[PDB]
Amino acid sequence: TLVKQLSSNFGAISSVLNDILARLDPPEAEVQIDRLITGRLQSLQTYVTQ
Amino acid sequence: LPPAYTNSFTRGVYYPDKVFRSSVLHSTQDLFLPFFSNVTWFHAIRFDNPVLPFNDGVYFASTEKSNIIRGWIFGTTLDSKTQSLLIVNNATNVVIKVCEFQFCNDPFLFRVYSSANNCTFEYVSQLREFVFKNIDGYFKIYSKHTPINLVRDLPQGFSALEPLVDLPIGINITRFQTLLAAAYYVGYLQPRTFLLKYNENGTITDAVDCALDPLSETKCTLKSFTVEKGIYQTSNF
Amino acid sequence: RVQPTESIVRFPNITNLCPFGEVFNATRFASVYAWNRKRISNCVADYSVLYNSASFSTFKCYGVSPTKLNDLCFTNVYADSFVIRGDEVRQIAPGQTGKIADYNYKLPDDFTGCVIAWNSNNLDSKVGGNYNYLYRLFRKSNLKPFERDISTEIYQAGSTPCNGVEGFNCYFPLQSYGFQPTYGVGYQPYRVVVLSFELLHAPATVCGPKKSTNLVKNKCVNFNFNGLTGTGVLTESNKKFLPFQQFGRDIDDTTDAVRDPQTLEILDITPCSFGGVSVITPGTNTSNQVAVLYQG
Ligand SMILES: *[C@@H]1O[C@H](CO)[C@@H](O)[C@H](O)[C@H]1NC(C)=O
Ligand SMILES: *[C@@H]1O[C@H](CO)[C@@H](O)[C@H](O)[C@H]1NC(C)=O
Ligand SMILES: *[C@@H]1O[C@H](CO)[C@@H](O)[C@H](O)[C@H]1NC(C)=O
Numbered sequence: 156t157l158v159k160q161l162s163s164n165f166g167a168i169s170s171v172l173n174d175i176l177a178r179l180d181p182p183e184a185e186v187q188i189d190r191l192i193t194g195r196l197q198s199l200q201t202y203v204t205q
Numbered sequence: 206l207p208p209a210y211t212n213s214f215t216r217g218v219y220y221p222d223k224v225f226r227s228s229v230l231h232s233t234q235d236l237f238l239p240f241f242s243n244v245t246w247f248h249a250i251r252f253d254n255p256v257l258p259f260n261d262g263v264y265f266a267s268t269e270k271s272n273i274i275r276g277w278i279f280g281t282t283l284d285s286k287t288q289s290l291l292i293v294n295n296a297t298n299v300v301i302k303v304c305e306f307q308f309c310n311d312p313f314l315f316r317v318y319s320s321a322n323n324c325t326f327e328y329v330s331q332l333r334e335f336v337f338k339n340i341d342g343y344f345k346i347y348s349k350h351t352p353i354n355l356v357r358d359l360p361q362g363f364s365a366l367e368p369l370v371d372l373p374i375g376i377n378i379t380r381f382q383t384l385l386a387a388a389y390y391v392g393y394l395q396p397r398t399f400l401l402k403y404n405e406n407g408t409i410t411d412a413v414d415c416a417l418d419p420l421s422e423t424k425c426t427l428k429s430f431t432v433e434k435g436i437y438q439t440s441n442f
Numbered sequence: 443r444v445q446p447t448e449s450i451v452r453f454p455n456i457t458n459l460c461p462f463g464e465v466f467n468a469t470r471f472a473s474v475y476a477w478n479r480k481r482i483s484n485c486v487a488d489y490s491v492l493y494n495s496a497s498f499s500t501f502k503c504y505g506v507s508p509t510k511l512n513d514l515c516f517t518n519v520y521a522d523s524f525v526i527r528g529d530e531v532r533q534i535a536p537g538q539t540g541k542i543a544d545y546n547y548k549l550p551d552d553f554t555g556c557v558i559a560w561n562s563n564n565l566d567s568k569v570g571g572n573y574n575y576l577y578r579l580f581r582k583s584n585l586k587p588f589e590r591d592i593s594t595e596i597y598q599a600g601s602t603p604c605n606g607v608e609g610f611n612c613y614f615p616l617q618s619y620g621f622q623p624t625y626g627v628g629y630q631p632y633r634v635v636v637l638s639f640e641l642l643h644a645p646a647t648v649c650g651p652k653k654s655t656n657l658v659k660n661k662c663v664n665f666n667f668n669g670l671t672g673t674g675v676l677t678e679s680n681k682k683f684l685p686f687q688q689f690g691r692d693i694d695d696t697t698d699a700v701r702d703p704q705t706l707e708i709l710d711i712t713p714c715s716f717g718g719v720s721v722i723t724p725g726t727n728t729s730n731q732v733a734v735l736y737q738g
């Protein structure tokens with residue numbers, strides 16, 4: 156389940172950071188990267204608690 | 206002569222995309238032909254060439270020996286007022302045209318259209334199972350041919366369908382008609398979710414309908430073709 | 443982490459130039475209600491002669507940064523051309539209202555593409571009247587995105603069905619623009635073109651200018667395969683791709699096999715070893731010598 160949580164948009168436009176770094180410059184890629192970071196932090200905390 | 210009916214036995218499974226897998230299970234949500242469907246049976250030999258609806262996909266399975274069936278036509282009104290599609294396979298090549306045709310009452314094999322006014326796309330080239338779809342303006346054809354002599358009905362077995370060609374046509378579709386011993390089956394697709402099993406080499410070997418009967422639902426939920434004794438939770442009504 | 447040494451790119455051969463000669467240099471434009479559509483493929487799209495060329499009034503576009511355009515492999519780019527009034531240029535956007543944005547031409551919310559508009563007053567102004575441009579004003583309901591309608595029926599404003607009389611409470615849905623040079627900039631006709639495209643969803647044929655390089659194996663490198671990016675070593679593959687498959691995926695839903703777009707050979711990719719670093723010490727009170735353990 157921890158592995159599979161890496162294929163979710165979490166509200167972004169893509170689930171891979173390599174498609175966010177391209178096609179976008181930092182100023183508006185930052186928000187989507189933030190969304191991905193928040194989702195993956197939540198997943199990590201849940202896994203650690205279990 | 207009133208139409209006849211029969212039942213397909215786990216037929217019409219095609220590779221959903223162009224991604225390779227091996228020895229893994231996978232769940233997809235796409236248009237398929239439900240198992241144990243009520244498919245219509247036609248006999249062309251007394252004439253039966255009715256225009257049949259094309260709702261969101263047709264599984265066309267035909268058994269042939271002398272190559273009696275020629276092709277299909279696709280369109281809305283078929284009177285050159287709108288755009289029409291043509292796929293004709295004569296003894297040399299598979300002609301594909303997208304023009305306005307004044308189709309005849311009984312187009313068979315060459316009395317097809319009275320005239321061709323405006324043309325947009327053309328193409329000229331150098332047991333059968335077919336699947337046709339129209340999504341996002343793309344016409345997709347999946348096909349695979351396997352010989353059979355066992356029964357005069359539709360044999361029961363599992364065969365995958367490989368992608369053949371995708372034609373960027375992008376026209377409005379609601380109806381179609383075949384171009385003509387000969388018999389063929391017509392089945393309609395509808396949105397379902399399936400579970401597919403890939404073998405070591407990467408060929409589909411089995412499938413399970415996720416929402417056919419409760420046991421198949423549990424198999425789909427567990428992502429396994431074998432379920433042991435116990436009680437499992439599925440969903441909420 | 444083993445630092446990648448070289449970077450490689452693999453693209454097919456493309457020599458044709460995209461048919462932009464009849465798109466931007468078009469002698470005449472179609473009516474906006476019956477907007478034009480064109481399919482562009484099998485060409486290199488050089489955007490250095492679009493952004494860095496004749497001054498386009500606006501180049502507002504979302505989803506894809508204009509600078510990075512030349513470095514992505516697109517998927518079936520689309521070109522739509524029509525003419526709208528200067529006041530109507532703002533309506534061409536997702537989440538917009540107005541007669542043009544609701545009854546004429548609508549964009550989807552997740553629209554990825556670039557819209558271009560430039561001044562077209564001189565070529566579309568007549569002293570006697572340029573009435574060749576028609577616009578939609580009355581229609582039943584909001585148009586669905588990327589849908590075109592050319593129906594011309596007498597709209598029924600209220601009761602008393604028209605039945606083709608165009609009487610009271612009966613108006614023609616189509617009206618003609620009147621374009622004089624002796625008008626305002628807000629009313630000035632604008633030539634606007636809309637580009638819409640997909641991204642990494644099928645085998646691609648448009649990639650832009652990018653010089654191909656050689657290929658290396660058994661070394662941690664950065665690779666670009668039809669726009670796909672990743673880090674890992676390239677090795678010979680023992681899998682059996684079917685002639686209709688261009689990628690390979692695992693349980694982890696990450697690519698592990700890729701077919702070379704030039705030599706038609708499949709390659710396996712595996713991650714560079716990372717591990718961890720641990721330090722073994724007997725205490726700084728006794729001695730200072732330490733031993734380092736590179737795990738796994
Ligand atoms: C299939 O459909 C026909 C007509 O809708 C109906 O008469 C028949 O009972 C259905 N089932 C089978 C098994 O043919
Ligand atoms: C098949 O049709 C094409 C085009 O309609 C034609 O060029 C070709 O000669 C035909 N072949 C036969 C055997 O009729
Ligand atoms: C369609 O046909 C009509 C009559 O032949 C012709 O006037 C018109 O220009 C044609 N349009 C196209 C797009 O070919």
Ligand SMILES: *[C@@H]1O[C@H](CO)[C@@H](O)[C@H](O)[C@H]1NC(C)=O
Nearest residue numbers: 280281282376377378379589
């Ligand atoms: C296709 O044509 C049918 C028949 O008039 C019509 O009901 C339907 O709305 C059309 N669909 C599109 C997408 O044009």
Ligand SMILES: *[C@@H]1O[C@H](CO)[C@@H](O)[C@H](O)[C@H]1NC(C)=O
Nearest residue numbers: 403404405406407408410682
């Ligand atoms: C895979 O293909 C090889 C060669 O065609 C064959 O020997 C082998 O039996 C196949 N594997 C399976 C599971 O069918």
Ligand SMILES: *[C@@H]1O[C@H](CO)[C@@H](O)[C@H](O)[C@H]1NC(C)=O
Nearest residue numbers: 461462463464465466467491
């Ligand atoms: C239009 O034509 C001019 C020469 O008349 C040329 O310099 C320019 O590049 C052309 N623009 C396009 C988009 O083809």
Ligand SMILES: *[C@@H]1O[C@H](CO)[C@@H](O)[C@H](O)[C@H]1NC(C)=O
Nearest residue numbers: 453454455456703704705706
């Ligand atoms: C491209 O050109 C090279 C040589 O110029 C050739 O070997 C290759 O087959 C061509 N096609 C592709 C897809 O690389």
Ligand SMILES: *[C@@H]1O[C@H](CO)[C@@H](O)[C@H](O)[C@H]1NC(C)=O
Nearest residue numbers: 723724725726727728729730
């Ligand atoms: C450090 O080692 C010495 C010699 O073994 C010992 O006398 C001393 O107590 C140790 N600890 C400290 C804080 O010096």
